[PDB]
Amino acid sequence: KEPCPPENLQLTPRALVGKWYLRTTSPDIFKQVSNITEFYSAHGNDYYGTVTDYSPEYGLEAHRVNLTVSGRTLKFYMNDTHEYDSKYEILAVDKDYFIFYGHPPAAPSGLALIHYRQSCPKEDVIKRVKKALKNVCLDYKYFGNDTSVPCHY
Ligand SMILES: *[C@@H]1O[C@H](CO)[C@@H](O[C@@H]2O[C@H](CO)[C@@H](O[C@@H]3O[C@H](CO)[C@@H](O)[C@H](O)[C@@H]3O)[C@H](O)[C@H]2NC(C)=O)[C@H](O)[C@H]1NC(C)=O
Ligand SMILES: *[C@@H]1O[C@H](CO)[C@@H](O[C@@H]2O[C@H](CO)[C@@H](O)[C@H](O)[C@H]2NC(C)=O)[C@H](O)[C@H]1NC(C)=O
Ligand SMILES: CCCCCCCC/C=C\CCCCCCCC(=O)O
Ligand SMILES: *[C@@H]1O[C@H](CO)[C@@H](O)[C@H](O)[C@H]1NC(C)=O
């Protein structure tokens, strides 16, 4: 579903620095790719870094990435495969998560992505994400999780 982005949400410089775990998406991408870890370094208002993931074809693999920021949107570019390259709009940003939405070749009718500071976010974080999604006209129940990552015994 297309979101209703906030009126004047700010994406602060360096908000995306460091390590994130891309654990929940709509539609669910996790039969195509899993165990997604992102690491971003600041370059001014932009970022560069690395995405690692488990590929059904290639196993654990790594890619260099660039994020080019303009206001509340950014351009995502990956070095060696381009199916996720798109403009993405920031929907929500928090100390513990961020959410963006774009239309890459992999999901051209729209792809919402939730990035977490924790590999297995605790319930308090998940509840805040639920609320943030409702505030942008989305609904957590229509997202899928990466069930390959062991978050429960
Ligand atoms: C899920 O993703 C995580 C994060 O990428 C994977 O953990 C990483 O696994 C690799 C391979 O075992 C580790 O690489 C090793 O790193 C050391 C030090 O740089 C190097 O000496 C070795 O030769 C090798 O490169 C890496 O450290 C490790 N990272 C963490 C934080 O544990 C994990 O394997 C993935 N799992 C699956 C099932 O996809
Ligand atoms: C895309 O980025 C990845 C990750 O940096 C590159 O992977 C490296 O490739 C070199 C050889 O070209 C190896 O010596 C490194 O060990 C690889 N690094 C990692 C972390 O896997 C990959 O080469 C890049 N691909 C292209 C086409 O630029
Ligand atoms: C902001 C977007 C975040 C995207 C992170 C998702 C991880 C993507 C990682 C690798 C994609 C590789 C897919 C290669 C498809 C090859 C096509 C084919 O031959 O079938
Ligand atoms: C994703 O995981 C959260 C946390 O365990 C859970 O509450 C939610 O129901 C999960 N989503 C699906 C579709 O299972």
Numbering used by the authors: 1 to 153
Q: What do the authors say?
A:
Surprisingly, these protein crystals diffracted to 1.2 Å resolution and we report the first structure of a naturally occurring and chemically unaltered, heterogeneous protein crystal grown in vivo at atomic resolution. A complete native data set was collected from a single crystal that diffracted to 1.2 Å resolution. c electron-density maps of the 1.2 Å resolution structure revealed densities for glycosylation at Asn35, Asn66, Asn79 and Asn145. At positions 35 and 79, one β-mannose (BMA) and two NAGs were identified. The NAG molecules are linked to one another and to the mannose molecules via β(1→4) glycosidic bond linkages. The crystallographic data concurred with the MS data for the presence of four N-linked glycosylation sites. Mass analysis of Lili-Mip crystals shows the presence of linoleic and oleic acids. In the crystal structure, we observed a long fatty-acid chain in the barrel that we surmise to be either linoleic acid or oleic acid. Residues Val51, Val65, Thr81, Ser86, Phe100 and Leu113 line the binding pocket and show multiple conformations, suggesting that both oleic acid-bound and linoleic acid-bound proteins co-exist in the crystal. We can conclude from these observations that the monomer obtained in each asymmetric unit is a space average from all of the sequences, i.e. the crystal is made from packing of proteins with multiple sequences.
Complementary DNA analyses revealed 22 distinct but similar peptides encoded by milk genes with homology to the lipocalin family of lipid-binding proteins, which are referred to as lipocalin-like milk proteins or Lili-Mip in this article. The data revealed glycosylated proteins that adopt a lipocalin fold, bind lipids and organize to form a tightly packed crystalline lattice. Lili-Mip serves as a complete nutrient by providing all of the essential amino acids, carbohydrates from the attached glycans, and lipids through chaperoning linoleic and oleic acids. After ingestion by the embryos, its increasing concentration in the midgut facilitates the crystallization of Lili-Mip.
